[PDB]
Amino acid sequence: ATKFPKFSQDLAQDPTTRRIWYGIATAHDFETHDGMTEENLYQKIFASHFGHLAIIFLWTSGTVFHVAWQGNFEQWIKDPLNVRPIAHAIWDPHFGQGAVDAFTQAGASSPVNVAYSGVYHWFYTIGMTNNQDLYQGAVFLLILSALFLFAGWLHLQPKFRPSLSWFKNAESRLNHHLAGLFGVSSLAWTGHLVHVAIPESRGVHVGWDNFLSVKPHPAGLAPFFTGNWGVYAQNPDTASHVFGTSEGAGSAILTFLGGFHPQTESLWLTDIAHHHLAIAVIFIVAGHMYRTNWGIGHSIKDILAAHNPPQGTPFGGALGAGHRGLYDTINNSLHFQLGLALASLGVITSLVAQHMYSLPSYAFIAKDYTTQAALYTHHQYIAGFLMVGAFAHGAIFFVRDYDPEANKDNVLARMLEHKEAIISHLSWVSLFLGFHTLGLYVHNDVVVAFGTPEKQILIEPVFAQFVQAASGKALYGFDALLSNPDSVASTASAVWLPGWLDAINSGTNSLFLNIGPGDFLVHHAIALGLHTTTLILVKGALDARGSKLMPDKKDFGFSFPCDGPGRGGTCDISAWDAFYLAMFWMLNTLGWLTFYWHWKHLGIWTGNVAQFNENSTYLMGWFRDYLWANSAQLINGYNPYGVNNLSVWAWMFLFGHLVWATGFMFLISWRGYWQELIETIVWAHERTPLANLVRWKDKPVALSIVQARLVGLAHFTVGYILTYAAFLIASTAGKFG
Amino acid sequence: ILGDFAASFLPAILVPAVGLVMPAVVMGLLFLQIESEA
């Protein structure tokens, strides 16, 4: 008879401490709430979306407000390569004199934190010049967050609560998301670029006062309607252009060089604007695809049902019934949509990480090395999170949303029909990568230890080097399709080539790095990590409904502890084991690739690339020249002789070690030991004098099995990101700082 | 240590409020919420 949790009455009559822990973790699982209909489910999700967008806009507003208020945006634009960006000030009652003296940095008179998110470069590139332009942006983002909050409150009122048919209107949502969310927003960003960012890069202040007066091109909107669009690409920016000022500046707003700015080592803003206008046109055209109200268009169900190879086709009826039963399976199940969304978002976040380091779009951000490291690692870890969550929600869809009657002999049913052929072949490719990657690493370790590094199996990655040469790199001498100037692709009308070729054949950027035998083995480690994490995830998603040891796995749901010690032992058999055991593999893979990125880029930025090129072929070079060598200035952030500016990073290093090792307690030690311990502690409380007056309302029990797997997983994860973020930031900030 | 930024006295008020005062308020209120019967 306890009012918490309100949404679950099974947990409300729980007399133990499991009620609070499970009311925290089942709060956002609206589908299992008591008295929940689909019509209320979709509206609560719709309002939670608005609350989350408001949280995003408030977080952005706080970031811009802390750049404006207690950061140094006036001083940084004068010398972006020397002045350290300030995130926010530090007010700590616990600082001694040493920490105040150490954290008084970046030209400040106060303890301040150095910004490593690199929003300073973003703001300088998009047109921010002074602190007032950041303050007005922060105030506008506050108004936008309040607007989203009022929209979310409004759509919970019964007058404005949308019907279920509005939420499942896929055709209109896709049209307005491609035409409006993707096309109109990219067109508007093109308008900002040609109206604010490109002229502010050329010294011309615009602001909100002069954008109706300053005309972006000398021929303003006259070549747009006549058709001679080349006028907007007649006078491009000179290679001697200096950013933020008028000398060397051009006049064209849509140039198409495809290279790098020689000063900022970034892509041209006119190139960015031209790219955004192109993709805005393509997104608007793609937004005019599905029929909504005016007859013309497409219906997704007809496209899916018409897509099945008939008889007489060389593949025949290999797909069975094809895709019929989809657009009901996908549209009815929110976990299918969520999994598809998370998979697409994880892939494009991986693309963001792989593209913002090799093709920087922000001014002077290629020469701020710690910003590049933080951005790449931050986006790749989030991409791993999104991808594991995509597969977890695929597992949730199979266990509680998959209907075999509706999906009868379609592609989705035939995935489950051979669901363990996939698992067996994915196990084979996981072992095929793992045995031989570890075999070559251990072989190289043993022969380097035995004084014979020439007995290493060094393999030149000739396929990826062929790809590099096909993209225009003449270093490997393949002479293939862009490396030679007499190819059919090189002799075309491709006018990106004069910029792209000397952008890719210059070693002063991160564009298409030199790869050797130390890049082959780490790439196969990466392939092993993705294949194995996919093996846990596919294995738990396809075995979510049930299998040979546990046929009725769908009756207990997605997340249950076990099915007892009977039938041989049944620990980690729920489809939640896929998520739980694949967080470890995802974190290991992201550790492998972020160690790869950090060590290769440390060799590049230091100017001594030979260290990675000879020591990454064996694991002791990884362990010594990357971990031990670059942890030196980290762990000396505070010593008996003083305090550096990296003392907070050494403290976070140790903090991440402590949380990561505390996770081992929940992951190795299991529940009944702790229940037996808490029973003795309960006896000691109830039998001592003067403390038995204080009685618990809920009976203290140990954390449940899934709860403790989750708690150890969260500790492992939080310790993992905290200690690697500390090591990364201090390692590449004690050198380049 | 007060900063050179505008309204430097606001970290001296908001940081102990968000770090000590309102977490005590939120834990007291959530304790009364999750432990009240009926």
Partner: peptide
């Protein structure tokens, strides 16, 4: 740099999402 009054202006502007977040959270509870 921004002025001292602009910080208090941004704070009382921030009370408008402060109130509306409290109004959305209670209606999301219902």
């Amino acid at each position: 740099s921004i002025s001292e009054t602009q910080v208090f202006v941004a704070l009382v502007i921030a009370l408008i999402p402060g109130i509306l977040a409290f109004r959305l959270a209670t209606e999301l509870y219902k």
